[PDB]
């Protein structure tokens, strides 16, 4: 039972969540001037473009042959989240008349690779940007949607203009109590324990684990924070930090019995204190307020994790604007 926003979709009309019954009106791609390729996805290519009619830059996401089921969902979710704080705006959906290839037109964000940008950040910079990702996540959760793929790679930042956007809504899904969800989502490094132990009855809490992994990696200057060689090893990398005592307690509560594979590789680990991750290069940002915030997010028990709504109230953010 998610603390917040559990029954959002229950009180919403079927049209809101039934994305496969969505009638898409594809427009002519003529007005969008295609320029430099800025991104590469699993089943897409993102280009810097220009809306010649509305005097506006855009990011044109061309789509490789994927079932309409996947596109319709991404479109429905982006539509339902329009005007959300720090959520990428979908401006148009276009289809080539000849090739019949669909493309999604998004507002353009001048991003700099996090591997180049993040080291240039100050304590005040990470503070502000994490608050903004929390605002985005509190909005989509309130709209009955889980992002299911929060990672530094899906956060666009134009540092010069202090503009931040949560992108990649392709894996985003609607939360319905009692529904079993595909555990084979998110980057292995940002996959919550519920995905690793095959707990299909997960919720919004999944996004706080992923954001916790991101925040830990940023302030401890170690990305990916938990670096597993496989899905089974990823739980070991987690347990080697959070301790196995709280893991066994988590499995006993949700009555989950680990695979014949897990029992051998998983040892008995004591919880590593967050202080053991401090270095000369990171103590300046790895202060006591942020470590408390990380401690409240990286918790096995998805039901015991802090909500984005609550995280925003934390003293780490003293956001008097
Ligand atoms: N609006 C945008 N502004 C700037 N860059 C963008 C924008 N949208 C996408 N990109 C870039 O394109 C890359 C891939 O885009 P995106 O994450 O939306 O696709 P994807 O979901 O992985 O693709 P697919 O679902 O087809 O596999 C991003 O990592 C980013 O660098
Ligand atoms: Cl894997």
Residue numbers in the entry: 12 to 332
Task: Give the authors' words.
In contrast to many kinases that only become activated upon receiving specific regulatory signals, CK2 is a pleiotropic and constitutively active Ser/Thr kinase that phosphorylates and regulates the activity of a suprisingly large number of proteins, including transcriptional activators. In contrast, PfCK2 achieves its quaternary structure using one single catalytic (α) and two regulatory (β1 and β2) subunits. Moreover, reverse genetics experiments showed that the catalytic α subunit α of PfCK2 is essential for pathogen survival, during its replicative cycle whithin the host red blood cells, making of PfCK2 a promising drug target. Consistent with the overall high level of amino-acid sequence identity of 65%, PfCK2α shares with its human ortholog the canonical kinase bi-lobular tertiary structure with a N-terminal domain arranged around a central β-sheet and a bundle of α-helices forming the C-terminal domain.
Here, as a first step towards this goal, we report the bacterial expression, purification and crystallization of an enzymatically inactive mutant of PfCK2α having the mutation D179S and its crystal structure bound to ATP at 3.0 Å resolution. A significant improvement in crystals quality was obtained when the inactive mutant PfCK2αD179S was used. The structure was refined to Rwork /Rfree = 0.192/0.231 at a resolution of 3.0 Å. Clear electron density was visible for all three molecules (named A, B, C) present in the asymmetric unit, allowing unequivocal assignement for of all main chain and a majority of side chain atoms for the polypeptide chain up to residue 328. A residual difference electron density map at a level of 5 σ allowed unambiguous building of the bound ATP for each of the three molecules present in the asymmetric unit. Here, the ATP moiety is bound in the active site in the absence of divalent metal ions (Mg2+) that are seen to coordinate the phosphate groups in nucleotide binding proteins, indicating that the energy contributions of active site residues are sufficient for substrate binding. Based on the conformations adopted by these three elements, the present crystal structure reveals that PfCK2αD179S most resembles an active conformation. Six amino-acid substitutions are observed at the ATP binding site between the human (Arg43, Leu45, Glu55, Val66, His115, Val116) and Plasmodium enzyme (Lys47, Ile49, Asn59, Ala70, Tyr119, Ile120), giving rise to subtle alterations of the shape of the ATP binding pocket. The loss of the interaction between the α-phosphate and Asp149 results in the triphosphate moiety being buried more deeply in the PfCK2 catalytic cleft, making ionic contact (distance of 3 Å) with Lys81. This closer contact formed with the “IGRG” motif (residues 49–52 of PfCK2) by the ATP molecule displaces the β1 strand from the conformation it adopts in the active human enzyme.
